[PDB]
Design an enzyme around this catalytic site. Structure first.
Site, PDB file in Angstrom:
ATOM      1  CB  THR A 268     -87.713 -15.706 -97.098  1.00 14.67           C
ATOM      2  OG1 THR A 268     -88.623 -14.604 -97.233  1.00 14.67           O
ATOM      3  CG2 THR A 268     -86.399 -15.366 -97.756  1.00 14.67           C
ATOM      4  CG  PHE A 393     -85.439 -12.523 -89.618  1.00  8.21           C
ATOM      5  CD1 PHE A 393     -86.221 -12.796 -90.740  1.00  8.21           C
ATOM      6  CD2 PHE A 393     -85.717 -13.205 -88.436  1.00  8.21           C
ATOM      7  CE1 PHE A 393     -87.276 -13.734 -90.692  1.00  8.21           C
ATOM      8  CE2 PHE A 393     -86.764 -14.139 -88.382  1.00  8.21           C
ATOM      9  CZ  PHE A 393     -87.547 -14.401 -89.520  1.00  8.21           C
ATOM     10  CB  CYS A 400     -86.321  -9.234 -91.807  1.00 11.55           C
ATOM     11  SG  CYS A 400     -87.558  -9.772 -92.935  1.00 11.55           S
TER      12      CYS A 400
HETATM   13  C1  HEM Z   1     -88.413 -16.466 -93.006  1.00 10.70           C
HETATM   14  C2  HEM Z   1     -88.622 -15.428 -93.853  1.00 10.70           C
HETATM   15  C3  HEM Z   1     -87.761 -14.346 -94.080  1.00 10.70           C
HETATM   16  C4  HEM Z   1     -86.383 -14.315 -94.007  1.00 10.70           C
HETATM   17  C5  HEM Z   1     -85.424 -15.398 -93.523  1.00 10.70           C
HETATM   18  C6  HEM Z   1     -86.022 -12.959 -94.411  1.00 10.70           C
HETATM   19  C7  HEM Z   1     -84.747 -12.469 -94.375  1.00 10.70           C
HETATM   20  C8  HEM Z   1     -84.367 -11.150 -94.622  1.00 10.70           C
HETATM   21  C9  HEM Z   1     -82.983 -10.704 -94.643  1.00 10.70           C
HETATM   22  C10 HEM Z   1     -81.739 -11.517 -94.286  1.00 10.70           C
HETATM   23  C11 HEM Z   1     -82.974  -9.411 -95.003  1.00 10.70           C
HETATM   24  C12 HEM Z   1     -81.725  -8.528 -95.033  1.00 10.70           C
HETATM   25  C13 HEM Z   1     -80.876  -8.738 -96.265  1.00 10.70           C
HETATM   26  C14 HEM Z   1     -79.642  -7.876 -96.288  1.00 10.70           C
HETATM   27  O1  HEM Z   1     -79.208  -7.395 -95.212  1.00 10.70           O
HETATM   28  O2  HEM Z   1     -79.086  -7.705 -97.393  1.00 10.70           O
HETATM   29  C15 HEM Z   1     -84.365  -9.051 -95.209  1.00 10.70           C
HETATM   30  C16 HEM Z   1     -84.772  -7.832 -95.686  1.00 10.70           C
HETATM   31  C17 HEM Z   1     -86.087  -7.495 -95.949  1.00 10.70           C
HETATM   32  N1  HEM Z   1     -87.165  -8.337 -95.798  1.00 10.70           N
HETATM   33 FE1  HEM Z   1     -87.175 -10.181 -95.096  1.00 10.70          FE
HETATM   34  N2  HEM Z   1     -87.131 -12.144 -94.704  1.00 10.70           N
HETATM   35  C18 HEM Z   1     -88.211 -12.999 -94.505  1.00 10.70           C
HETATM   36  C19 HEM Z   1     -89.543 -12.579 -94.650  1.00 10.70           C
HETATM   37  C20 HEM Z   1     -89.976 -11.289 -95.045  1.00 10.70           C
HETATM   38  C21 HEM Z   1     -91.375 -10.881 -95.228  1.00 10.70           C
HETATM   39  C22 HEM Z   1     -92.597 -11.795 -95.010  1.00 10.70           C
HETATM   40  C23 HEM Z   1     -91.371  -9.585 -95.689  1.00 10.70           C
HETATM   41  C24 HEM Z   1     -92.431  -8.744 -96.020  1.00 10.70           C
HETATM   42  C25 HEM Z   1     -93.765  -9.002 -96.002  1.00 10.70           C
HETATM   43  C26 HEM Z   1     -89.972  -9.227 -95.800  1.00 10.70           C
HETATM   44  C27 HEM Z   1     -89.532  -8.029 -96.297  1.00 10.70           C
HETATM   45  C28 HEM Z   1     -88.219  -7.610 -96.313  1.00 10.70           C
HETATM   46  C29 HEM Z   1     -87.790  -6.329 -96.777  1.00 10.70           C
HETATM   47  C30 HEM Z   1     -88.599  -5.271 -97.489  1.00 10.70           C
HETATM   48  C31 HEM Z   1     -86.495  -6.264 -96.553  1.00 10.70           C
HETATM   49  C32 HEM Z   1     -85.595  -5.119 -96.918  1.00 10.70           C
HETATM   50  C33 HEM Z   1     -85.279  -4.378 -95.635  1.00 10.70           C
HETATM   51  C34 HEM Z   1     -84.313  -3.244 -95.841  1.00 10.70           C
HETATM   52  O3  HEM Z   1     -83.134  -3.514 -96.151  1.00 10.70           O
HETATM   53  O4  HEM Z   1     -84.747  -2.092 -95.683  1.00 10.70           O
HETATM   54  N3  HEM Z   1     -89.122 -10.235 -95.361  1.00 10.70           N
HETATM   55  N4  HEM Z   1     -85.226 -10.115 -94.945  1.00 10.70           N
END
Ligand code: HEM
Ligand SMILES: CCCCCC/C=C\CCCCCCCC(=O)O
Length: 455
Positions: A268, A393, A400
């Site tokens: 992402t 996010f 996120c």
């Molecule tokens: C621009 C970059 C990023 C975008 C746009 C993004 C977007 C998201 C989104 C939309 C979700 C929620 C999905 C849902 O509700 O089904 C999410 C969950 C998560 N993201 Fe990111 N993410 C990014 C970068 C990162 C980074 C760098 C990490 C970790 C180093 C990360 C780790 C996670 C984790 C583990 C979740 C799961 C959270 C949970 O539901 O407990 N993300 N992210």
């Protein structure tokens, strides 16, 4: 009155499935959204869900009291290798909350201050690569961004060096990762899965899952045999205990958390950096703006955590690019209890809702009659943005976890890039967004002319 749920053409038993037969499902959905409006039903053999585009409905779906995170079919498939890691586990699943509590600490203000050093280690390798290039050569944008991103999360979160910049050919892990995502995406359009045609696709799927796990095994083994005292995600997965249960993560889940952070923590972001750069190059004066801002804040050869926090404009660039093209294009919810969406759409308990994030960010009623324009300035006053109008996010408790890691990394690197190079769109690249669940500009290439400034 109750409004009849609007929905695209159906093909008998196939329902709307044939509509999604493509390399770009999200973009197709965007068009259908454009034609059907704020909300429509998408039915397929077995499943059924509603895609929301308008903020007025989104804000409702984003109410934890009525809707909790649902595992979209996409994520259900990703579960095959991501298991019950944060990203792919249900909220009311022991491992989720547990891991959430256990892992959250690794993303605090202080932590970011510790990661920063290693981030720069990679960022430099990037600038170096680009500085070491010669006249006839050009850079392959998303390729090197992904190169950067994977290396960063690997070092920062697991202290393992993928050494992506030491290879011209895609790190094996990437190659298998993209294939596993791609397959996950293809399965969504399959009418009959057991068809022996898919047999090959399945053998290859397993193959790629195994390669990913092989890496995990190397990361863990490498950790065991090292001079440690590292305070990263890995030591927290292996040692931290959930204060609510006193229990630490089991090996099976720990594995899942590694795969999860490796994939989720790099794809992402690189996509974000690629889109950002695309827009900068296509919007010269905005680029010029971000270039100057960088030039004055990054006085030191190598940026500091604070200087990075001072890169106001470039951060805006990031949020704008993230507005038009959210790298994680959607999230799903389910009616926690019988209710009625928008006072028009009656939902039963367990009813799936799907948030087309890229459309929500194109809602003119929130953003104005120019939604399709790259105007960083829209984020001059964050206060102006109504909540649930900009949800790149995810939402609420299931948002996120690495959000700030991404933005800190993106800002740092974008800052350095603009500081040291003159980027030329030597091919007038026409945007092509490749889909592997996540979004990214394909074939985006440029030429970086050195400002001949050291670091
Ligand atoms: C621009 C970059 C990023 C975008 C746009 C993004 C977007 C998201 C989104 C939309 C979700 C929620 C999905 C849902 O509700 O089904 C999410 C969950 C998560 N993201 Fe990111 N993410 C990014 C970068 C990162 C980074 C760098 C990490 C970790 C180093 C990360 C780790 C996670 C984790 C583990 C979740 C799961 C959270 C949970 O539901 O407990 N993300 N992210
Ligand atoms: C844990 C693995 C990393 C996360 C990979 C997936 C990330 C975000 C999922 C976006 C899904 C977009 C769904 C589009 C397909 C559809 O709706 O039919």
């Amino acid at each position: 009155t109750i409004k009849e749920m609007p929905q695209p053409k159906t093909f008998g038993e196939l329902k709307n499935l044939p509509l999604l037969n493509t390399d770009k499902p999200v973009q197709a959905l965007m068009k259908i959204a454009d034609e059907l409006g704020e909300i429509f039903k998408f039915e397929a053999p077995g499943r059924v869900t509603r895609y929301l585009s308008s903020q007025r409905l989104i804000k409702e779906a984003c109410d934890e009291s009525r809707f909790d995170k649902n595992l979209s079919q996409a994520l259900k498939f990703v579960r095959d290798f991501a298991g019950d890691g944060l990203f792919t586990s249900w909220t009311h699943e022991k491992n989720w909350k547990k891991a959430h509590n256990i892992l959250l600490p690794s993303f605090s203000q202080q932590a970011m201050k510790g990661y920063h050093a290693m981030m720069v280690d990679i960022a430099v390798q990037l600038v170096q690569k680009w500085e070491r290039l010669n006249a006839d050569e050009h850079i392959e944008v998303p390729e090197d961004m992904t190169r950067l991103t994977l290396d960063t999360i690997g070092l920062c979160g697991f202290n393992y060096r993928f050494n992506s910049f030491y290879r011209d050919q895609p790190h094996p892990f990437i190659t298998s990762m993209v294939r596993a995502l791609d397959e996950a995406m293809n399965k969504l359009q399959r009418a009959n899965p057991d068809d022996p045609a898919y047999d090959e696709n399945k053998r290859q799927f397993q193959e790629d899952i195994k390669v990913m796990n092989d890496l995990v095994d190397k990361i863990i083994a490498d950790r065991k045999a090292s001079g440690e005292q590292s305070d990263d995600l890995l030591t927290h997965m292996l040692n931290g205990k959930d204060p609510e249960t006193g229990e630490p993560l089991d090996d099976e889940n720990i594995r899942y958390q590694i795969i999860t952070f490796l994939i989720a923590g790099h794809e992402t972001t690189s996509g974000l950096l690629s889109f950002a750069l695309y827009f900068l190059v296509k919007n010269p004066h905005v680029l010029q703006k971000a270039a100057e801002e960088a030039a004055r804040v990054l006085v030191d050869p190598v940026p500091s955590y604070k200087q990075v926090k001072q890169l106001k404009y470039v951060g805006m660039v990031l949020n704008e690019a993230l507005r038009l093209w959210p790298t994680a294009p959607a999230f799903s919810l389910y009616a926690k209890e019988d209710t009625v969406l928008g006072g028009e759409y009656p939902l039963e308990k367990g009813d799936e809702l799907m948030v087309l994030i890229p459309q929500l960010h194109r809602d003119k009623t929130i953003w104005g009659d120019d939604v399709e324009e790259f105007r960083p300035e829209r984020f001059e006053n964050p206060s102006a943005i109504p909540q649930h109008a900009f949800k790149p996010f995810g939402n609420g408790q299931r948002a996120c976890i690495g959000q700030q890691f991404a933005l800190h990394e993106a800002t740092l690197v974008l800052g350095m890039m603009l500081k040291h190079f003159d980027f030329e769109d030597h091919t007038n690249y026409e945007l092509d967004i490749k889909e592997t669940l996540t979004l990214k500009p394909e074939g985006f290439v440029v030429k970086a002319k050195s400002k001949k400034i050291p670091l």
